[PDB]
C-alpha cells in the first residue's frame, strides 16, 4: 500500500499494457509450442515411415 495519493489511470495503464503483451505472448507461446510439438511429432513419424 503506497502512502501517496491514488492514481487510477496510471495504475490501470501499467496493468493493461502488461496484460495486452502477456496475452499475445501466451497465445504466441502456446501456438509456437503446439506447432513445434506437431512438427517435432511428425518429423520422427515421417523419418521412421520413410
Amino acid at each position: 500500500v503506497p502512502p501517496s495519493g491514488s492514481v487510477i489511470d496510471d495504475y490501470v495503464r501499467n496493468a493493461s499494457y502488461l496484460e495486452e503483451r502477456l496475452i499475445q505472448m501466451e497465445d504466441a507461446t502456446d501456438q509456437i509450442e503446439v506447432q513445434k510439438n506437431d512438427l517435432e511429432q511428425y518429423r520422427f513419424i515421417l523419418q521412421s515411415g520413410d
Partner: protein, 462 residues
C-alpha cells in the same frame, strides 16, 4: 477609487507587506537630517491617518512621489509606497489618488523610475502600484513594461526560486500585465528570460510526491498559485498563433512535462491550464499544427493522458470540454492523414517511428496492393532498409532500435497480412537477421521480431 485587487489578496504580498508594516519610519527626523523636505514629511505623516481615519491621496500624491524620488532610503520609500499601495487598492479611503494617477501619466512615469532601487520589496511595491494603474483603460504604457522586463534587478529577483513571494509577485505582475493585447508583444519579446522560471516551478512541484508535504508547494495554495500563475502566464502568451508555434517548437521539451504535471496534480487549476495550453497550442489556427500535434502526441503522449483524463473528469465543465475538444482533434489529427503517404514518407525519409495508425493491420492491408508494383519492391525496400540498418549501424543502438522495432512491427503486420510476402524476405535476405535479432537485447523489439518470425513461421506449417 475602485482599483482592481489583482495581486493584492495573496498571502505573499501581505507577508512582505507585514515586515514593512511592522517597522516604523519617522519622516520628520529624516527631513530634519537633510534627507527630505518638510512638506513631504508632513504629508507622509499626515497620509497615514487618512487610511484608518478614512475607512485625499490625490493632493498628497505629488509630495509622496517627490519625496520618494528625492529620498534614497528603502524603508521610507517602502513605507510610503506600501501606504500608497494600500490606500490605492482600498475602496473607502483615498479615492482621489487613483484618479490622479490615471489623469496625469507623469506621476506614474516618475514613480516607475524609483522602482528596482534599494531592496527587492520596494520594486514589487512600486511595480504593483504602477502595474495597478497600468492595467486600467486610462493609461497604457508599453515602454514601462518593456523597460521593466529589460531590467536586470526584476529578472534577478524573479529568477530566485527560494522565495515564493518574489517569484509569485514577479510572475503575477507579468501575468497581470500580459492580459492586455498590446503588452503581449513586448512581454513576448522578453519572455526568454522568465521562460525557464515558469517551467522550473512546475518541475519542482511535479518532483514532489504525495506521501510528504514539501515546503514550497506540493498540494498547498502557494505552490498551486505559483504553478497556476506560471501556467496562466504561459497560457496568456499562448493565445497568439505564432507565439504558440514558436514557443511550442522551441520549448517543447520543457513544455512536455505539462501533461505529467496535470496528471500528477489533483487540482483542476494546474490541469485546466495545462490541458488548455495543449488544446490551445493544438488548434488549427496555429501555423504547423500537424507537426506540433505529431511531436506533442508522439513525444509528449497526450493521447493516453487525454483518453484516461476523459474518463476521470473534474467538476469544471471547461476542463472536460477542453479535454474532450482537444481529444477529438488529437485523435482525428493522426487519423486524418493517409496511410500510404505516411508509410511512403516515413520509409522514404529513412526514419521509422510509432503512430496511432501505424499499429493497425488495415493500413498494411490497404497499402499492400498499392505497394506491390515490382514483385513487392516496397516490402523488399523496407526489409532492405531494416537489414541494411542492422548490418551498417549494429543493434544495441538508440537510432537503429526504433527503426528496427517499427520495421519489425510493420514487417510482422505486412507478413501476417498476406502469405505472398514471405518470398520477398527469403529472396532479399532479411529473414536471417530476424531470427538473430530476437536473441539480442531490446526484448520488446525481440518480441516484435518474435511476432514477425512467428507470423512467417505460422504460414509454413499449419
Amino acid at each position: 477609487m475602485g482599483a482592481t485587487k489583482i495581486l493584492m489578496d495573496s498571502t505573499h504580498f501581505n507577508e512582505i507587506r507585514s515586515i514593512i508594516r511592522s517597522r516604523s519610519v519617522a519622516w520628520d527626523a529624516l527631513a530634519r537630517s537633510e534627507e527630505l523636505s518638510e512638506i513631504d514629511a508632513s504629508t507622509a505623516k499626515a497620509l497615514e491617518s487618512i487610511l484608518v481615519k478614512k475607512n485625499v491621496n490625490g493632493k498628497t500624491l505629488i509630495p509622496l512621489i517627490h519625496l520618494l524620488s528625492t529620498s534614497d532610503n528603502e524603508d521610507c520609500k517602502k513605507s510610503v509606497q506600501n501606504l500608497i499601495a494600500e490606500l490605492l487598492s482600498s475602496d473607502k479611503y483615498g479615492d482621489d489618488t487613483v484618479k490622479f494617477f490615471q489623469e496625469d501619466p507623469k506621476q506614474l512615469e516618475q514613480l516607475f523610475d524609483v522602482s528596482l532601487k534599494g531592496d527587492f520589496q520596494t520594486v514589487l511595491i512600486s511595480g504593483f502600484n504602477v502595474v495597478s494603474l497600468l492595467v486600467q483603460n486610462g493609461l497604457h504604457n508599453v515602454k514601462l513594461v518593456e523597460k521593466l522586463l529589460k531590467n536586470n534587478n526584476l529578472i534577478n529577483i524573479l529568477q530566485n526560486i527560494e522565495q515564493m513571494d518574489t517569484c509569485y509577485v514577479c510572475i503575477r505582475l507579468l501575468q497581470e500585465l500580459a492580459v492586455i493585447p498590446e503588452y503581449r508583444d513586448v512581454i513576448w519579446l522578453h519572455e526568454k528570460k522568465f521562460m525557464p522560471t515558469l517551467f522550473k516551478i512546475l518541475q519542482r512541484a511535479t518532483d514532489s510526491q504525495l506521501a510528504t508535504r514539501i515546503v514550497a508547494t506540493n498540494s498547498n495554495h502557494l505552490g498551486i498559485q505559483l504553478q497556476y500563475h506560471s501556467l496562466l502566464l504561459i497560457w496568456l502568451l499562448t493565445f497568439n498563433p505564432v507565439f504558440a508555434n514558436e514557443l511550442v517548437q522551441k520549448y517543447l521539451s520543457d513544455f512536455l512535462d505539462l501533461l505529467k504535471l496535470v496528471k500528477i496534480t489533483i487540482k483542476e487549476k494546474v490541469s485546466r491550464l495545462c490541458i488548455s495550453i495543449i488544446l490551445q497550442c493544438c488548434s488549427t489556427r496555429v501555423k504547423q499544427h500537424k507537426k506540433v500535434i505529431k511531436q506533442l502526441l508522439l513525444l509528449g503522449n497526450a493521447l493516453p493522458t487525454v483518453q484516461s483524463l476523459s474518463e476521470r473528469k473534474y467538476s469544471d465543465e471547461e476542463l472536460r470540454q477542453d479535454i474532450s475538444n482537444l481529444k477529438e482533434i488529437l485523435e482525428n489529427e493522426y487519423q486524418e492523414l493517409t496511410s500510404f503517404d505516411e508509410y511512403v514518407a516515413e520509409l522514404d525519409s529513412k526514419l521509422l517511428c510509432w503512430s496511432p495508425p501505424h499499429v493497425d493491420n488495415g493500413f498494411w492491408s490497404d497499402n499492400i496492393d498499392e505497394f506491390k508494383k515490382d514483385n513487392y519492391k516496397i516490402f523488399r525496400q523496407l526489409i532492405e532498409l531494416l537489414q541494411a540498418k542492422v548490418r551498417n549501424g549494429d543493434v544495441n543502438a538508440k537510432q537503429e532500435k526504433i527503426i528496427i522495432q517499427v520495421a519489425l512491427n510493420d514487417i510482422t503486420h505486412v507478413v501476417e497480412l498476406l502469405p505472398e510476402s514471405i518470398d520477398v524476405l527469403d529472396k532479399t535476405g532479411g529473414k536471417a537477421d530476424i531470427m538473430e535479432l530476437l536473441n539480442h537485447s531490446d526484448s520488446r523489439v525481440k518480441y516484435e521480431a518474435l511476432k514477425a518470425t512467428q507470423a512467417i513461421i505460422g504460414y509454413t506449417f499449419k
